[PDB]
Amino acid sequence: TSQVRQNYHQDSEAAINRQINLELYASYVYLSMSYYFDRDDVALKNFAKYFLHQSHEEREHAEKLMKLQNQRGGRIFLQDIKKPDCDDWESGLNAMECALHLEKNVNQSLLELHKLATDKNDPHLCDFIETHYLNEQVKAIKELGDHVTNLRKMGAPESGLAEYLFDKHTLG
Amino acid sequence: TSQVRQNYHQDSEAAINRQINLELYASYVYLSMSYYFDRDDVALKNFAKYFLHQSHEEREHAEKLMKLQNQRGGRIFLQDIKKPDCDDWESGLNAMECALHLEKNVNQSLLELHKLATDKNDPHLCDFIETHYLNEQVKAIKELGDHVTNLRKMGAPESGLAEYLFDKHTLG
Amino acid sequence: TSQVRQNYHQDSEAAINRQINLELYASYVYLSMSYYFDRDDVALKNFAKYFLHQSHEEREHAEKLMKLQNQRGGRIFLQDIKKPDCDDWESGLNAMECALHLEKNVNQSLLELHKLATDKNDPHLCDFIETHYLNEQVKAIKELGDHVTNLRKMGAPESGLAEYLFDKHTLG
Amino acid sequence: TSQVRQNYHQDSEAAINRQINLELYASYVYLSMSYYFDRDDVALKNFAKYFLHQSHEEREHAEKLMKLQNQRGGRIFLQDIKKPDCDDWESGLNAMECALHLEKNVNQSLLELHKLATDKNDPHLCDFIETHYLNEQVKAIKELGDHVTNLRKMGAPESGLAEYLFDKHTLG
Amino acid sequence: TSQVRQNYHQDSEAAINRQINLELYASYVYLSMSYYFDRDDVALKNFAKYFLHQSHEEREHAEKLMKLQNQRGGRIFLQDIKKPDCDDWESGLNAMECALHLEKNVNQSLLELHKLATDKNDPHLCDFIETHYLNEQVKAIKELGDHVTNLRKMGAPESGLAEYLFDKHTLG
Amino acid sequence: TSQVRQNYHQDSEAAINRQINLELYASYVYLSMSYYFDRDDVALKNFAKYFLHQSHEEREHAEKLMKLQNQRGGRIFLQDIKKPDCDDWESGLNAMECALHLEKNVNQSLLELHKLATDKNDPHLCDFIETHYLNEQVKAIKELGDHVTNLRKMGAPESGLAEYLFDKHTLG
């Protein structure tokens, strides 16, 4: 019934609201990770800075989908942001692996959303997803895979020197 | 028979020529609207400035399509630019509503053009439409819907104060 | 019935509307010419730039007459902009000759308009036509005649080298 | 068992975690409000900007309490962020009144937290709450009360002109 | 088996490796052309500069596809770069025509690659091809067609003055 | 039969063409190495940057010999650029050792070329090889030997920390 709505299916609107909830959840997971590494018994400041920056980026992604929802005449329906799976992320390597798993989950959701927008013949939504989300997801997954590989090769879970030097040289 | 033509169907060429005429028509409609608000008995200078700017933008859109037609080896066939439906646009609110209706007409034509380019397997034409036209149309429709909503809430057709203050504060 | 209208005859108003239509037609003809020289099988970029600049100038001329029509309390009545006579302008020399013919048509219409404004004793309209249109028309006709002479002396229709070097040295 | 923990009671730690959840909830409520006013049928851009700025401020407040929790050797335990009470905030005045109610809820929670820290003889926590939260809350409550008063005096729920001019002059 | 691979079919990976080989081949063809025009018995310095610039561009295109292959978790498999078809390119016009034929070959390969990525439902690969390759190919084909048209109209193969002046004025 | 050719034997011309092919091959080997270290399961960015820089340098060396071939009136005859020996370079140390072996191969070819130019009494070709290639080769071999020594002393193939810190401190 919106005066600006055109070629915007209800299923696309619902999937955009689900993706908003997902992006907000990812922001909250990265916030949890960031303040894990700020703990006195962990104390990796550049890990904390990295994951805080990621949480702010995911908040920006969610706000951009909300802006899209209003642009197409859809209506934003927000849900509870579930707490993350862990309070103790146990190491820098484990947190990078969980971040990698999370970003691949987000990517898969975006590919489902693009498939839906293609099936409903919504070229503006397809192009929005392609230009603003898919390449950013691919780049994030590649960066996290690079970090996981470098931590593993340096012997990260056993050797705290590996996590320390990675914090200094890569994330610093 | 053009030496540069590749993967460019005749139906796509004809639809691009129709879209060129459509964009030129929209430019002429906005020119009419702009000099309606320049009338002494109407006298809304920022409405006039807004619609003149829109007229020039639509001319740029048409020239971009013509450029595309030459880039793909198609041949531009121009038609008469029909005169707009009204000479008297009757109010700022009415003109914004007519502009909204016009932009949704333009958007529907572009979505038909994208569906045609998808059916003819022309990825360059699809990406051209997505990157240069679709988002711009969505943004224009959202802006015009915002203006119509603000004018209606201010009591625009009865109260000339509403049109005056909208001219000053939003369009100024 | 306009509160601003003074010494402005109805025949002058109708002739101004006809001149607006004619300036818009000239702008559309120059747009056609400009994208003719942008074609891959023609490819004279500075001819295209020259005629695009002329189309924008003619649009400015039309908008200035519309501004005059509102200044004097007349009412703008727009008509269809007819398509130009040709889609294929066949050469740079032929397009310059057609442009020359067009500008002399525009000039003759303006001289008819000045004769009408003189007969109706409208000194403001006479001075408007003299200051903004007549000297610009004679300068345009002189420039186009210069271009036609230079192309003909260079052997333009047979020798493509003439059109090429004119594109580079005069229009570039 | 933290090596940094000194004079930091478990009840204070639990109340800090509750306050973190409450600040995150407030950020999510303001995000909801901000994109309500971004809707095409509402379209108050400066209301949207104001509430988005408030959401970012509440996120900063939550991150500062998380930083405090790590500074004192407490452990952050995050909970679900509940969805806000409304999706449709119905007007600028209603949203300001709900924001006022929310900020007074946040202030009451902070006063309970200060009473707890006073009863547990934790001067650092008391001073943290006083310097970073209490003045900011009373300034926020005073500003929102000012906005509510100005909207009501302008006749906000009936007259959309009041909301429009408040959006322009106070929030703009 | 790559930790970053998601929605990336093996056939897409193989087609990306074929496209890498083809871009490297095109770079080598343009290198051959560039040093043809550097010969003492040909001596067209701006033709040489133009084709050397094209060879460096094609090298950049190949490196960007290799980057893409690593980003998606595919594995680069390089092949022999075949020698170009000619050592003697015989004229500036013939070299421009061969360059045009080459770019249309590259464009057809990219359209096959986009059709494959569309059939395998890989939106990131489709968007990568659209944003980085298709419009660049269309622009290159249009530019080369323009050059071929201008050389032919100037009488290029018989008249060396045509090639000389084109070298100076268009490519210089 | 070239008007420029003087004191330039056919055997020297053939050996210059062989050296061009060898420099292009070396550029392609370094390109392969560079995008090996860009892989997600390798992820040594400064190794990738180093070998990409080397590939561009070898391309410059090849273009300089092509320029020499045209300067002396010889004629460039290009051959296929063979694919490198490996797709998987297995470690930073192994890639540095292969690069060292490659540069010593290139150096031996250049010494054969200088011996040929000395035997044919071509002082310009001898001086060209001495000034532009021989000192650059011995500097490259010395640098690669330094890198291999430093990697071996740090325990490179077993310890990934060695490769990581070398990537950061020496190549970064």
CB contacts, 8 Å: B82 with chain C? 80
Q: Say how many C-beta atoms besides its own lie within 10 A of residue B163's C-beta.
A: 21
- Residue in F166, F8, F26 with CA at minimum distance from that of residue F108: F26
Q: Which tokens hold the place of E68?
A: 């893409």
Q: Which tokens hold the place of C156?
A: 């333009």
**Contact in structure between A123 and A143 (CB atoms under 8 Å):** no
Specify which residues C59 forms β-bridges with.
none
B2 in contact with chain C, both atoms CB, cutoff 8 A: yes
**C-alpha to C-alpha distance for A111 and C74, rounded to whole angstroms:** 59
Q: Which tokens hold the place of E171?
A: 């490519």
E45 falls within a domain: yes
Q: Which residues of B57-68 are buried (b: 16+ CB within 10 A; e: fewer)?
A: bbbebbbebbeb
Task: Phi first, then psi: give them for residue B9, nearest 5 degrees.
Answer: -75, 155
Measured CA distances, D85 to A74, D82, D93, D145, E170 (Å): 20, 9, 16, 21, 67
**C-alpha to C-alpha distance for A81 and B11, rounded to whole angstroms:** 49
- Residue in F87, F31, F30, F89 with CA at minimum distance from that of residue E63: F31
Give the method used: cryo-EM
Amino acid code (one letter) for C2: S
D54 in contact with chain A, both atoms CB, cutoff 8 A: no
Flag if A148 and E70 touch (Cβ within 8 Å).
Answer: no
**End-to-end alpha carbon distance in chain C:** 51
Specify which residues E6 forms β-bridges with.
none
* DSSP code, position F42: T
- Residue in E27, F159, D65, E73 with CA at minimum distance from that of residue A155: F159
**End-to-end alpha carbon distance in chain D:** 51
With both helix axes pointing from N to C terminus, report the angle between D92-119 and D160-169 in degrees, rounded to the nearest 10: 60
**Contact in structure between F152 and F96 (CB atoms under 8 Å):** no
- Residue in F61, F57, F62, F56 with CA at minimum distance from that of residue F76: F62
E35 falls within a domain: yes
Q: Which tokens hold the place of E44?
A: 């067209």
**Contact in structure between B37 and B48 (CB atoms under 8 Å):** yes
The response to whether F103 counts as a known ligand-binding position is: yes
Flag if A114 and E128 touch (Cβ within 8 Å).
Answer: no
**Contact in structure between D151 and D92 (CB atoms under 8 Å):** yes
C141 falls within a domain: yes
Q: Which tokens hold the place of A6?
A: 């055109």
Alpha-carbon torsion E95, E98, E102, E103, what sign? positive
* Cβ-proximal residues to B61 (8 Å cutoff; 6+ apart), any chain: B23, B26, B132, B133, B136
Range of the domain at C48: 10-170
DSSP code per residue over E16-85: HHHHHHHHHHHHHHHHHHHHHTTSTTT--HHHHHHHHHHHHHHHHHHHHHHHHHHHTT-------BPPPS
Alpha-carbon torsion A46, A48, A52, A55, what sign? positive
**C-alpha to C-alpha distance for A38 and A49, rounded to whole angstroms:** 9
With both helix axes pointing from N to C terminus, report the angle between C45-71 and C92-119 in degrees, rounded to the nearest 10: 10
Q: Say how many C-beta atoms besides its own lie within 10 A of residue C155's C-beta.
A: 13
B134 falls within a domain: yes
Specify which residues D81 forms β-bridges with.
A81
Q: Say how many C-beta atoms besides its own lie within 10 A of residue B110's C-beta.
A: 24
Measured CA distances, D72 to D13, D42, D121, D134 (Å): 9, 45, 14, 20
**C-alpha to C-alpha distance for F110 and F117, rounded to whole angstroms:** 10
**Contact in structure between E25 and E55 (CB atoms under 8 Å):** no
Q: Tokens 């904390």 map to which residue?
A: A48
* Cβ-proximal residues to B42 (8 Å cutoff; 6+ apart), any chain: B36
Alpha-carbon torsion E55, E58, E62, E64, what sign? positive
Measured CA distances, E6 to A134, B111, E73, E122 (Å): 12, 30, 8, 10
Flag if E138 and B72 touch (Cβ within 8 Å).
Answer: yes
Amino acid code (one letter) for B128: F
E3 falls within a domain: no
CATH of the domain at C42: 1.20.1260.10
**Contact in structure between D118 and D126 (CB atoms under 8 Å):** yes
Specify which residues F81 forms β-bridges with.
E81
* Chain mean position to CA E25: 8
Q: Tokens 């630019």 map to which residue?
A: B81
Specify which residues B81 forms β-bridges with.
C81
The dihedral over CA atoms of B112, B118, B121, B124, expressed in degrees to the nearest 10, equals 90
Q: Which tokens hold the place of A115?
A: 């498939």
**Contact in structure between D96 and A65 (CB atoms under 8 Å):** no
**C-alpha to C-alpha distance for B152 and D4, rounded to whole angstroms:** 61
Q: For chain F, what is the radius of gyration of the CA atoms?
A: 18
Measured CA distances, A133 to A107, A128, A136, F149 (Å): 8, 8, 5, 45
Alpha-carbon torsion F84, F86, F87, F89, what sign? negative
3-state secondary structure of B81: strand
**C-alpha to C-alpha distance for B47 and B45, rounded to whole angstroms:** 6
3-state secondary structure of E145: helix
DSSP code per residue over B133-145: IIHHHHHHHHHHH
Q: Which tokens hold the place of B150?
A: 């603000």
Q: Which tokens hold the place of A139?
A: 């780049």
B118 in contact with chain E, both atoms CB, cutoff 8 A: no
Q: Say how many C-beta atoms besides its own lie within 10 A of residue B69's C-beta.
A: 23
A55 falls within a domain: yes
DSSP code per residue over A52-67: HHHHHHHHHHHHHHHH
> Helices (H), strands (E): how many in chain A?
6, 0
* DSSP code, position A2: -
Measured CA distances, A8 to A14, A113, A117, B108 (Å): 11, 13, 9, 12
CB contacts, 8 Å: B74 with chain C? none
**Contact in structure between C111 and C56 (CB atoms under 8 Å):** no
**C-alpha to C-alpha distance for A128 and A141, rounded to whole angstroms:** 20
Q: Tokens 């943290």 map to which residue?
A: D128
**Contact in structure between E127 and A110 (CB atoms under 8 Å):** no
Amino acid code (one letter) for B28: Y
Give the HSE-up count for residue B43: Cα atoms under 13 Å, Cβ half-sphere.
Answer: 9
Q: Is B6 exposed, middle or buried (0-12, 13-18, 19+ CB in 10 A)?
A: middle
**C-alpha to C-alpha distance for F156 and F162, rounded to whole angstroms:** 5
Phi-psi region of D43 (alpha: psi -120 to 50; beta: other; left: phi over 0): left
Q: Tokens 């007074």 map to which residue?
A: D104
Q: Say how many C-beta atoms besides its own lie within 10 A of residue B94's C-beta.
A: 17
What is the distance in angstroms between the Cα of A67 and the nearest Cα belonging to chain E? 22
Amino acid code (one letter) for F138: V
F1 falls within a domain: no
DSSP code per residue over E89-141: --SHHHHHHHHHHHHHHHHHHHHHHHHHHHHTT-HHHHHHHIIIIIHHHHHHH
A39 in contact with chain D, both atoms CB, cutoff 8 A: yes
**Contact in structure between E156 and E93 (CB atoms under 8 Å):** yes
3-state secondary structure of D147: helix
* DSSP code, position F160: H
**Contact in structure between A40 and D2 (CB atoms under 8 Å):** yes
SS (H, E, C) chain C: CCCCCCCCCHHHHHHHHHHHHHHHHHHHHHHHHHHHCCCCCCCCHHHHHHHHHHHHHHHHHHHHHHHHHHHCCCCCCCCCECCCCCCCCCCHHHHHHHHHHHHHHHHHHHHHHHHHHHHCCCHHHHHHHHHHHHHHHHHHHHHHHHHHHHHHHCCCCCCHHHHHHHHHHCCC
* Cβ-proximal residues to F133 (8 Å cutoff; 6+ apart), any chain: F61, F110
B9 in contact with chain E, both atoms CB, cutoff 8 A: no
3-state secondary structure of A81: strand
**Contact in structure between A19 and A107 (CB atoms under 8 Å):** no
C41 in contact with chain E, both atoms CB, cutoff 8 A: yes
Give chain E's domain count. Answer: 1
Ranges of beta strands (E only) in F92-160 are none
Measured CA distances, D70 to A28, A40, B83, D5 (Å): 17, 7, 70, 9
Breaks in chain C (C–N > 2.5 Å) following residue: none
**Contact in structure between F28 and E81 (CB atoms under 8 Å):** yes
The response to whether D58 counts as a known ligand-binding position is: yes
Q: Tokens 């000239």 map to which residue?
A: C26
* Chain mean position to CA B159: 28
Which chains contact F through at least 3 pairs of Cβ atoms less than 8 Å apart? A, E
CB contacts, 8 Å: D40 with chain B? 142, 145-146, 149
**C-alpha to C-alpha distance for D76 and D57, rounded to whole angstroms:** 20
Q: Say how many C-beta atoms besides its own lie within 10 A of residue F102's C-beta.
A: 23
- Residue in F109, F108, F102, F85 with CA at minimum distance from that of residue F20: F109
Q: Which residues of F117-155 are buried (b: 16+ CB within 10 A; e: fewer)?
A: beebebeebbebbeeebeebbeebbeebeebbebbeebe
D2 falls within a domain: no
B112 in contact with chain D, both atoms CB, cutoff 8 A: no
**C-alpha to C-alpha distance for F7 and F123, rounded to whole angstroms:** 9
**C-alpha to C-alpha distance for B133 and E122, rounded to whole angstroms:** 23
**Contact in structure between D126 and D117 (CB atoms under 8 Å):** yes
Q: Which tokens hold the place of C164?
A: 């090429």
D49 in contact with chain A, both atoms CB, cutoff 8 A: no
Give the HSE-up count for residue B100: Cα atoms under 13 Å, Cβ half-sphere.
Answer: 20
**C-alpha to C-alpha distance for B40 and C3, rounded to whole angstroms:** 8
Q: Which tokens hold the place of D18?
A: 């509750």
3-state secondary structure of F106: helix
**C-alpha to C-alpha distance for B23 and C23, rounded to whole angstroms:** 19
Q: Is F79 exposed, middle or buried (0-12, 13-18, 19+ CB in 10 A)?
A: middle
CB contacts, 8 Å: A72 with chain B? 138
Q: Which tokens hold the place of B40?
A: 């002494």
Q: For chain C, what is the radius of gyration of the CA atoms?
A: 18
* DSSP code, position F4: S
CB contacts, 8 Å: F45 with chain A? 146
Q: Which tokens hold the place of B83?
A: 């005169």
Angle, CA of A59, A63 and A65, to the nearest 5°: 120
* DSSP code, position A132: I
**C-alpha to C-alpha distance for C34 and C89, rounded to whole angstroms:** 10
CB contacts, 8 Å: C92 with chain E? none
Specify which residues C81 forms β-bridges with.
B81
- Residue in D95, D79, D58, D19 with CA at minimum distance from that of residue A80: D79
Q: Which tokens hold the place of B28?
A: 């002429």
3-state secondary structure of F81: strand
Residue F85, H or E segment: none
- Residue in C89, C63, C93, C68 with CA at minimum distance from that of residue C156: C93
The response to whether A147 counts as a known ligand-binding position is: no
* Chain mean position to CA B30: 8
**Contact in structure between C77 and B87 (CB atoms under 8 Å):** yes
**End-to-end alpha carbon distance in chain A:** 51
